[PDB]
Design an enzyme around this catalytic site. Structure first.
Site, PDB file in Angstrom:
ATOM      1  N   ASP A   1       0.896  -0.911  -0.294  1.00  0.00           N
ATOM      2  CA  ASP A   1      -0.442  -0.195   0.223  1.00  0.00           C
ATOM      3  C   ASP A   1       0.773   1.430  -0.002  1.00  0.00           C
ATOM      4  O   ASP A   1       1.142   1.913   1.016  1.00  0.00           O
ATOM      5  CB  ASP A   1      -0.767   0.065   1.360  1.00  0.00           C
ATOM      6  CG  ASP A   1      -2.234   1.003   1.037  1.00  0.00           C
ATOM      7  OD1 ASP A   1      -2.250   2.070   0.298  1.00  0.00           O
ATOM      8  OD2 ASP A   1      -2.576   1.696   2.056  1.00  0.00           O
TER       9      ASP A   1
ATOM     10  N   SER B   1      -0.166  15.463 -12.536  1.00  0.00           N
ATOM     11  CA  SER B   1      -1.024  15.189 -13.493  1.00  0.00           C
ATOM     12  C   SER B   1      -0.789  16.735 -14.187  1.00  0.00           C
ATOM     13  O   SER B   1      -1.973  17.418 -13.848  1.00  0.00           O
ATOM     14  CB  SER B   1      -2.297  14.358 -13.640  1.00  0.00           C
ATOM     15  OG  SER B   1      -2.684  14.020 -14.841  1.00  0.00           O
TER      16      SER B   1
HETATM   17  C1  LIG Z   1      -7.128  -3.795   2.213  1.00  0.00           C
HETATM   18  C2  LIG Z   1      -6.984  -2.151   2.519  1.00  0.00           C
HETATM   19  C3  LIG Z   1      -6.781  -1.176   1.367  1.00  0.00           C
HETATM   20  C4  LIG Z   1      -5.891  -0.034   2.356  1.00  0.00           C
HETATM   21  N1  LIG Z   1      -7.666   1.128   2.536  1.00  0.00           N
HETATM   22  C5  LIG Z   1      -8.121   2.268   2.085  1.00  0.00           C
HETATM   23  N2  LIG Z   1      -7.403   2.575   0.022  1.00  0.00           N
HETATM   24  N3  LIG Z   1      -8.880   2.386   2.022  1.00  0.00           N
HETATM   25  C6  LIG Z   1      -8.076  -0.130   3.044  1.00  0.00           C
HETATM   26  C7  LIG Z   1      -8.112  -1.514   2.502  1.00  0.00           C
END
Ligand SMILES: CC1CCN(C(=N)N)CC1
Ligand SMILES: CC1CCN(C(=N)N)CC1
Length: 330
Positions: free
Chosen positions: A35, A199
């Site tokens: 992430d 962008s």
């Molecule tokens: C699985 C997770 C990824 C990050 N999240 C999000 N972008 N809101 C929460 C859920």
């Protein structure tokens, strides 16, 4: 050093991607969601409330000879969909694709929200935003990338997400076979802790390119592409029958449609997202209304270049002293 790991969609819609990560000694392999929009490495664990675990693989620190409680440290995080998790912290050895970090903070969940419980395919998150967003208290912790950086051949990682297919995360090198043409680099602001960039505009289908600055973040942890309401309206106006539905929570379109592509600018370069990438399928099983992959950011406070956008490119997260982002077609 370098590392290279395959990342795999969790389902047929590419709702998220999981990457195997080795934690502890002997290794415990968990499938984590990498992430670039957060900065905590947290896992389902032997400490997670039992009723909140449903099919995930758990990290058990007591079975790792290299695990050490980080005494007094706690963490708690909320995400953009209202999901959350919290717990305490261990340090342990963490390896991704052959690249090893010793002393990595591994945040052990005591509690996770229902959305996490309900997704058996995601065993935790590995944050790759800037460490200034890390939630560990009272001593903030570094991301896996931050800890690895000095040892890497080059202070970079790359995201090469697949459309309905596996892809790759590389650390420490740029695979010049993985993209076409050249990589266009663009400036990053770290002021909000994100890989935030601007962008240079957009086009809808074969339409003319609109030059306009769109500030947003490169976020592998968000599924969809969230852009200003003006831009999103211009896109969906090209699809017969498309509409914003308050009951569903976004733009929907007839499942019989052929979606136009969407182009975004990176400097003078252009990344084209094929129409198919913007189809997230029926809103409920058997429905003839389909959910759109481009949605308004109005309710969020930031534009998000999530997986829909990023999977159309080879993306370089350059963590040099002055960070930058690179995009190439592929
Ligand atoms: C699985 C997770 C990824 C990050 N999240 C999000 N972008 N809101 C929460 C859920
Ligand atoms: C906002 C919500 C949190 N994010 C995330 N974990 N990917 C970034 C966007």
């Amino acid at each position: 050093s370098t590392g290279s790991a395959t990342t795999t969609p969790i389902d047929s819609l590419d709702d998220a991607y999981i990457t195997p990560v080795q934690i502890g000694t002997p290794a415990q392999t968990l499938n984590l969601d990498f992430d670039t929009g957060s900065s905590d490495l947290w896992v389902f664990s032997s400490e997670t409330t039992a009723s909140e675990v449903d099919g995930q693989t758990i990290y058990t620190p007591s079975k790792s000879t290299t695990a050490k409680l980080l005494s007094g440290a706690t963490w708690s995080i909320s995400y953009g969909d209202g999901s959350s998790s919290s717990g305490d912290v261990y340090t342990d050895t963490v390896s991704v694709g052959g690249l090893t970090v010793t002393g990595q903070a591994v945040e052990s969940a005591k509690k996770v929200s229902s959305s996490f419980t309900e997704d058996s395919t995601i065993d935790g998150l590995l944050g790759l935003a800037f460490s200034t967003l890390n939630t560990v208290s009272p001593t903030q912790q570094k991301t896996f990338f931050d800890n690895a950086k000095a040892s890497l051949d080059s202070p970079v990682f790359t995201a090469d997400l697949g459309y309905h297919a596996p892809g790759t995360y590389n650390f420490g090198f740029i695979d010049t076979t993985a993209y076409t043409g050249s990589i266009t680099y663009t400036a990053v602001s770290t002021k909000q802790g994100f890989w935030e960039w601007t962008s240079t505009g957009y086009a809808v289908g074969s339409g003319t390119f609109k030059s306009t600055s769109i500030d947003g973040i490169a976020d592998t942890g968000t599924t969809l592409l969230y852009l200003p309401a003006t831009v999103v309206s211009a896109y969906w106006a090209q699809v017969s029958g498309a509409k914003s539905s308050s009951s569903v929570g976004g733009y929907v379109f007839p499942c019989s449609a052929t979606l136009p592509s969407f182009t975004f600018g990176v400097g003078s370069a252009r990344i084209v997202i094929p129409g198919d990438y913007i189809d997230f399928g029926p809103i409920s099983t058997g429905s003839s209304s389909c959910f759109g992959g481009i949605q308004s950011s109005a309710g969020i406070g930031i534009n998000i270049f999530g997986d829909v956008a990023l999977k159309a490119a080879f993306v370089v997260f350059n963590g040099a002293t002055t960070p930058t982002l690179g995009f190439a077609s592929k």
